[model samples]
Target: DYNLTEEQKAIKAKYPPVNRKYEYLDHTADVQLHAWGDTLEEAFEQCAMAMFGYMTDTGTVEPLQTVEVETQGDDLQSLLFHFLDEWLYKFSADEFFIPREVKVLSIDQRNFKLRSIGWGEEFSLSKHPQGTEVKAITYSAMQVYNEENPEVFVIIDI
Candidate 1:
């Protein structure tokens, strides 16, 4: 059975139904994702959703199951890389789940560790629209700006 922590439950309670703070960028051969938030944590969350968004229309996905992903890195870039990589793995290997909404439980920047949860059901072609498939996350020209408007730029292979 899937169970959420009290804190996780609270986070999900306040999560917006359709929070899309990310956009796609033109790349020579790969696709880039630009995501931002009031905080870096939310930016990271939005970045993950952006990747899933590329796989399908997130609006059609339902929150029937919850999946948790935890990752660590030597620095911010690596952290973001692994964070998104883990989510992609979940969708590619773990029951083909597609999250409609994702929330970051915590981001220990000092330690470069992050814990997040996503709510969505399995992918079904009949229900979800097919978008481009993201093969991998890359660090080429990756940028993370934590200024007044915290944002991140990530390039993923299609």
Candidate 2:
């Protein structure tokens, strides 16, 4: 991360949770996020939260509205990439909306399937503070692992 912008600094100055669901990383031009959870499923959920966090301050958004997404992949790796791509599609399809958080409805590792409900509200220019515009979720540096703890690293094209 280059020098944090005023907004970014303000958000981080609060000394948020020590075990944050995600943390931003400094990439050459785009932004990278590292999300973690106690398990793979939770880590996957946090991965979305981190992406949304980069888009805006999720804490400011509410769970008044919800949208459901279902997707699958040939394997776990493909599953996460595709799952995130689906969300990018969702936001792009609707201009005045964003997800605050995701609730994993179900996950079938046997077949690599995921069902999730994202809660959020219509976009309010004055309310939802926009950060970088994520062009898309890229495969660059994307990976998921469980080395003592579940973690996923993703680089978003901005």
Candidate 3:
């Protein structure tokens, strides 16, 4: 909150800064999302929200069902990639609904493993508005901005 720019601070103000999460960004050819949390796992959880936000209006999506996901990577960046990729796969293969919330069960940063649950109902156009179509999570300009009260910036292919 202290070092954040005026625009970033304004975004942070939209939600509780005490447990700050993610925010959307204007992008040219892709979607960009910035997420932060008091813990790295929390940051990742917010990143999940950002992803689903693109799929549908998560605010209106119901928590009718819970979806589980697991993945691993060699590092934090890859972990983020795998995490997002797994969700994308779930969306495409199982037709998992846009997630209204995400709970990260466990995250082994050293082992680079992750376990999580997403809550949402099946996709219903009548209920949720269609937003951006995120095709894939990309490495382009993706980075973890901080380790203490972590911040992450990611670009998704549209």
Best by TM-score: 1
**Candidate 3 deviant stretches above 4 angstroms:** 1-20
Q: Give the alpha carbon lDDT tens digit for every residue of 50-132 in model 2.
A: 88777777666666787988999987878889999988788777655677778667778899999988877876656667676
Model 3 agreement with the true structure over 1-158: per-residue lDDT tens digits: 12334543443345332232788776687878898887788888888887877776565556678899899988888888889888887776667566668878888967989999987777765555666678888986768755557878899988
Q: Show model 2 residue runs off by greater than 4 Å.
A: 1-19
Q: Which stretches of candidate 1 lie over 4 Å from their true place?
A: 1-16
Query: What is the C-alpha local distance difference test score of each model?
Result: 0.84, 0.77, 0.75
After the best TM-score superposition of candidate 1, give how far the Cα of residue 23 lies from its true spot, in angstroms. Answer: 1.0
User: What 10-residue stretch in candidate 1 is worst by lDDT?
Assistant: 1-10
lDDT of 1 by residue, 1-158 (tens): 12444544454465455867999976767898999999999999999988888887676666889999999999898899999989998888859989988898888979999999999988877666777788888887778887799899999998
Better of 2 and 3 by lDDT: 2
**What TM-score, computed on C-alpha atoms, does each candidate reach?**
0.86, 0.82, 0.82
* Stretch of 10 with least lDDT, candidate 3: 11-20
Candidate 3 positional error at 155, Å: 0.5
Report RMSD (Å) for each prediction in the order shown: 7.8, 4.5, 7.7
Candidate 3's error at 146, in angstroms?
5.2
